[PDB]
Design a protein around this ligand. Structure first.
Ligand code: NA
Ligand code: NA
Length: 56
């Protein structure tokens, strides 16, 4: 529903994670966890650290 901004480059470390580039605009899918948010990066879905993204 919401959009988030990738504040840093982040390379996924596990299958459930996804990679993002600084400045990417991600779709926020699930932010119920305080440390890991599920996002859509382009056509991929996965988790990134909440600390590395900013809600828009
Ligand atoms: Na992955
Ligand atoms: Na954040």
């Amino acid at each position: 529903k919401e959009l988030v901004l990738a504040l840093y480059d982040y390379q996924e470390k596990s299958p459930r994670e996804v990679t993002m580039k600084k400045g990417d605009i991600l779709t926020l899918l699930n932010s119920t966890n305080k440390d890991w948010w599920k996002v859509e990066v382009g056509d991929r879905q996965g988790f990134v650290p909440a600390a590395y993204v900013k809600k828009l």
